[PDB]
Amino acid sequence: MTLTRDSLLTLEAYAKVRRQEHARVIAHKKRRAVSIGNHLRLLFEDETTIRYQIHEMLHIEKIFDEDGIQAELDAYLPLVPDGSNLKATLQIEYENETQRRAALARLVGIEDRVFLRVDDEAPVYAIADEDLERDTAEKTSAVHFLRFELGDAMKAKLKAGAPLSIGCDHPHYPIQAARIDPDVAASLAGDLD
Amino acid sequence: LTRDSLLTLEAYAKVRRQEHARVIAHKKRRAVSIGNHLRLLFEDETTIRYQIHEMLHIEKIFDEDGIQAELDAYLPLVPDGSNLKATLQIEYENETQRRAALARLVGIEDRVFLRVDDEAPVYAIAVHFLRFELGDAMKAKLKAGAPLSIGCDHPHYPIQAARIDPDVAASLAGDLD
Ligand SMILES: [Cl-]
């Protein structure tokens, strides 16, 4: 997939199905979500997850003009897998403002230290926040957009059902590479061409 | 806000619950919204002292260099006598939408302006914060209770100047020497 303005429901048509969509997409995300320790969450993004977010943004902001719709499509384009990469939203979650505030400082650069490993191939580190200019990218955020680029040997093994593991080697958030749910890895394999 | 004025970890820990309550109350006279997605907090010695103590507490910092570092980090946010200083937050219904908005909002800080009565607007100058430098005429009018308005003329976030609640404006005037 890519998505275009014609891929989207109007505000009226979405509002009619919104509650049903919240449930449909929650169910879908069971095949797309991974936790990394107690405070990091990754959602691997696909047509379903991205279309929903766009619908949600348009609904809440009440956006129905053509340039405004297009601007949300273009804002969410970073999440679209392209054939050779998995895309994920990383969220850092802490119980309170002071805790979160302290964590975000301590965890600076964590979005660059999350890695995947398909079977025994070389690990692949996320490339984060390429949609943000250098200065914006340097400001911390509880939310990052990640890209994991996979080569041919990794694509073959993943589609063949090999184990997929995720880790982090940030000094303040060391997570030993651990196998992802095979049902989730199977869903991810389908994103790749 | 001096070095000798900070509380030890032990002393702050004793007052922390009460201080939270007191600062939440205080921030009600300091916070201003610009449209639906921008939230400013006008900083003063009360909000900045609270922030320092919170970070010393949470990270358990009791070494001199570390304590002095936290102070150095926040001391720039304390108004200097002829100025107002605010921290800006961008806020959406959830955090993923906020992140999806950030690229469009680049440069928003430079486009936030205040206007004291019918004086010229003052644009913010870009721990990040917004610094609004007031001229003597503006300082006097504000102190004397004139209207204070705030807006934004960023191309992705055009918000017409709106008057700030008079109780908040009164608090801000007290920052001025
Ligand atoms: Cl002050």
Side-chain angles (χ1 to χ4, degrees), chain A residues 1 3-96 98-99 101-133 135-193, chain B residues 1-16 18-127 129-177:
Chain A
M1 130 262 22
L3 288 177
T4 79
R5 289 195 300 279
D6 300 330
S7 315
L8 304 179
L9 299 181
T10 56
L11 291 181
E12 169 180 358
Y14 184 72
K16 285 170 161 76
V17 295
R18 178 177 191 226
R19 257 199 45 79
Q20 184 176 56
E21 291 295 90
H22 295 311
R24 191 175 65 87
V25 167
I26 283 171
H28 183 75
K29 286 177 178 187
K30 292 175 187 168
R31 304 205 62 213
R32 304 301 298 191
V34 192
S35 285
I36 303 175
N38 290 330
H39 303 278
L40 266 53
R41 300 296 176 263
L42 275 183
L43 184 73
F44 287 88
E45 305 276 0
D46 64 19
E47 186 183 27
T48 298
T49 65
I50 299 167
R51 191 157 175 276
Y52 175 72
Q53 282 168 259
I54 296 160
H55 281 153
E56 278 299 298
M57 183 75 94
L58 302 173
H59 177 84
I60 288 164
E61 300 298 304
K62 302 180 188 305
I63 300 168
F64 58 92
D65 67 293
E66 186 188 300
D67 288 348
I69 296 156
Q70 193 56 54
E72 303 307 337
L73 277 163
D74 292 347
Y76 286 93
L77 189 65
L79 309 183
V80 180
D82 57 18
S84 280
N85 51 28
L86 300 177
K87 306 294 188 68
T89 298
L90 176 70
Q91 292 200 63
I92 300 161
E93 296 165 347
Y94 279 82
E95 301 219 311
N96 57 60
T98 48
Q99 191 71 38
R101 201 170 169 75
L104 291 178
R106 183 170 61 251
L107 295 184
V108 59
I110 197 167
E111 69 279 11
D112 305 323
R113 307 314 309 180
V114 168
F115 65 95
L116 281 172
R117 190 197 272 256
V118 178
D119 201 33
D120 61 342
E121 303 288 326
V124 169
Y125 286 71
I127 303 300
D129 307 319
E130 286 168 292
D131 59 316
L132 295 182
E133 299 178 43
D135 283 303
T136 313
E138 200 202 25
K139 273 163 261 206
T140 62
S141 182
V143 183
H144 295 271
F145 289 173
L146 309 183
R147 166 167 79 82
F148 294 98
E149 207 75 29
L150 281 51
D152 186 62
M154 297 173 198
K155 286 189 193 168
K157 285 184 171 180
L158 194 60
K159 290 171 167 294
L164 180 59
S165 296
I166 189 172
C168 185
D169 67 3
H170 193 285
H172 298 279
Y173 206 87
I175 304 301
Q176 283 252 302
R179 184 175 184 170
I180 287 165
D181 181 342
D183 186 75
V184 171
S187 178
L188 272 38
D191 293 352
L192 299 159
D193 78 7
Chain B
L1 199 22
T2 67
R3 168 61 181 91
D4 291 357
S5 71
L6 305 172
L7 295 182
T8 59
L9 292 181
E10 290 80 356
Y12 183 64
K14 283 198 186 77
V15 291
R16 182 170 194 235
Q18 295 157 86
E19 280 303 294
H20 191 39
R22 204 185 53 86
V23 161
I24 285 164
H26 182 77
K27 286 170 174 183
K28 295 194 211 169
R29 303 197 68 212
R30 304 297 296 187
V32 174
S33 289
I34 310 173
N36 297 331
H37 296 300
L38 289 188
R39 300 289 177 265
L40 266 76
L41 177 69
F42 282 87
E43 303 289 357
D44 59 20
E45 100 170 76
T46 307
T47 64
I48 292 314
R49 194 181 304 282
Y50 174 80
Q51 176 63 207
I52 292 159
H53 285 140
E54 284 290 302
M55 293 296 100
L56 292 181
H57 180 92
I58 207 63
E59 291 285 1
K60 305 188 206 283
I61 298 159
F62 58 84
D63 66 287
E64 187 60 29
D65 286 350
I67 289 165
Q68 188 61 43
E70 289 309 308
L71 177 53
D72 293 340
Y74 289 100
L75 195 55
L77 284 55
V78 176
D80 304 301
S82 294
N83 68 11
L84 296 171
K85 298 185 182 172
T87 49
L88 180 63
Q89 287 179 332
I90 295 177
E91 192 177 338
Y92 282 73
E93 168 144 331
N94 62 50
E95 295 216 306
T96 61
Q97 294 173 349
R98 177 189 178 277
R99 173 58 178 74
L102 294 189
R104 279 163 290 168
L105 291 177
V106 163
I108 191 101
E109 320 80 75
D110 312 304
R111 310 312 315 168
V112 169
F113 59 94
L114 287 171
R115 183 180 63 244
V116 176
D117 202 353
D118 196 19
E119 293 281 312
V122 171
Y123 282 80
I125 300 168
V127 180
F129 65 100
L130 305 180
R131 179 169 51 86
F132 299 92
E133 290 297 340
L134 281 47
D136 300 347
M138 291 175 200
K139 282 180 73 185
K141 288 183 154 226
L142 189 63
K143 278 184 225 200
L148 183 55
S149 301
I150 188 159
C152 187
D153 67 5
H154 188 278
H156 289 285
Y157 201 76
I159 302 278
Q160 169 180 353
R163 213 191 140 161
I164 285 162
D165 284 0
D167 291 329
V168 174
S171 182
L172 275 39
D175 297 359
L176 302 176
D177 76 9

